[model samples]
Target chain A: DMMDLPRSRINAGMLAQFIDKPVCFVGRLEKIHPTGKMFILSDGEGKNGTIELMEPLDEEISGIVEVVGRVTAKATILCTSYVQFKEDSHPFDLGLYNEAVKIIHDFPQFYPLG
Target chain B: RAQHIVPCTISQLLSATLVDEVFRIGNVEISQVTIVGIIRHAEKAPTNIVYKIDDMTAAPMDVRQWVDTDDTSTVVPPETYVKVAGHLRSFQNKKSLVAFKIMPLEDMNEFTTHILEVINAHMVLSKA
Candidate 1:
């Protein structure tokens, strides 16, 4: 049920309202997973959680970007949508770079996902 | 009051015969002795306290007096031999001793060499 909502539905100012509840968020891609292509969307405050990018982004959508997905919890926002790149030339390393990105994206809470 | 003032080596002191008794005495006065042991952990910088020291006896020696040198950027790695000289006292209601002057004996062998080098190099350069 939580995964159905779009991340854009939530905003930074309203973060406290859904402390323990599962929600969604939309933010820029801040970091990539070290072991996979997974990426995380955050407000850069290290507050919002991460998202598993289904596929590697093209060069055009590498840096500042946005996603629309539901948050697994109050802090983590899992983007179900495609990663939007701000610039082009973001290389694809035959999934190596993307794999690392996935690792970093899932590190904090989604690790050891059963 | 200890019944027997036995001058036994550190290994002998660890024996069961002396373990309980030695601990009961809490602190003892040693004239001069070299104790070889491993340093367990030294407090972080800005607080150079050597809180724990252990040897074959596995008994922790509380030496908090040296913590005052924390501001100095000297690191004492674990397992290094250190010689402590001072009157042993009951520390924190436990059996322990305090070192008035604790020195690292690892470099003792090179002491004369360093002294000679310092004197030879600086003595000639100084006008006085």
Candidate 2:
């Protein structure tokens, strides 16, 4: 009725909303276990910071990054779709990014959201 | 397949979508959508028009169009740039579009302009 996004698009702290639905997370890679299968993300702004990825990344990433995944009730991201990333040069490039952006009808469907 | 997805490739989406119109029907929170493209093939059979639609995205999809008469070739021939309104349908296990309405454009500018309209449908929110 309101013609808005049917679901809520939230940040890392709001992982609870993602329990069964999908969401996009854009942040820096905090900790990705070398063994693979997991990584941490942080957008560096609000209390809603830091998200962990349960899905495997296609390649090694270590900078300004974006992740799309489903949030389990446990607030864990699984089957995660890696959005985009770059070795930040951070403190300088604080501009906005569409990492967590949705596709035209879907969100973040295309690759290399670069 | 997680957060959001279209998987239609860049050239497929075209430009912007009419959010208000789309909202009127289904909940347009990111969905299977209608697209704009041209017919790569013309004449032939029941499902006459074979449309090739690309939105400047990497890939384009084949849309099979059925005329009102049903099972007949369409009036518009090949290379006709038409605006298509359809839903995401499955022919097999893969995704495709079943066009509901197909109109040929007179003014080519409708391309960039309508796409801009499509781009305007951002329903973003935050927790205070």
Candidate 3:
């Protein structure tokens, strides 16, 4: 939580500038399926600020959560990593996110697809 | 400038050609690369932590992370999705990763996107 940079600190409201780019996004778990196959996530900005998992998970999560990936669109992110903490969490994974962005910058074709 | 090492998919890492002991993905030559997957097996040794993982592709691989417990980085647990940074190595015809960093994932969506990234690599090579 203590180790983080400004660029890495992101919320659903500020996901626009990071479209098609990797970011460390923090939000809340609105709803999740029992199977853990998919769920709705947000930063408490209503449904318009949510992202669907569309993937299977081994467990369930609640409360404030942290997800890392590229923002494909306004309120959507294609996560490359996820983390949940009962104790408040911060986006300290900027090292990884920024590196991924640099790689994408080197290879335009590797850009995140929405 | 040295290229920033990046995490890719296990399936894609396994697909690259091992030329002169280096793994190549398209035009990119990797001295170090990264991967995200779920560990199927894990063993903690005195010198390092070894883990086996697959990205839902059934193509499992082992990774060995040398211990430096004092470091603040997260150490991944088995059966959980993880992010790994490492180099490719082989022992007696079997390939395994020599890891630098390892962390367990909190969001499962990361897996879905990495798979897509791997697919993107495949497409790039397909047309070339």
Best DockQ among the predictions, by candidate number = 3
Look at candidate 2 and tell me the lDDT of residue B58. Answer: 31
Give the alpha carbon lDDT tens digit for every residue of A14-54 in model 1.
45554544333435556677644566655433344466555
Least lDDT summed over 10 consecutive residues: which range in candidate 2 chain B? B119-128
Evaluated on chain B only, what is the TM-score of candidate 1? 0.46
Report the TM-score of the second chain of model 2 against its true counterpart. Answer: 0.59
Cα-based RMSD of the predictions, in order?
23.5, 14.2, 10.9
Q: lDDT tens digits, residues B1-128, model 1? A: 33322221232222212243234212332322234344666765353355466432234455554544446425556645465554344434454444555566444222223223322322332322
| Per-residue lDDT over B1-128 for candidate 2, one digit per residue giving the tens place of the 0 to 100 score | 33343323333333324443331112333445555545545545554556655433334566666767555534676555567776655443444566667787664444434443344432221110
Model 1: CAPRI class: incorrect
lDDT tens digits by residue: candidate 3, A28-71:
67787666654666553332244545576767577656665557
Give residue B73's error in model 1 in angstroms: 12
TM-score of each: 0.29, 0.37, 0.48
Which of the numbered candidates is closest to the native, going by highest lDDT? 3
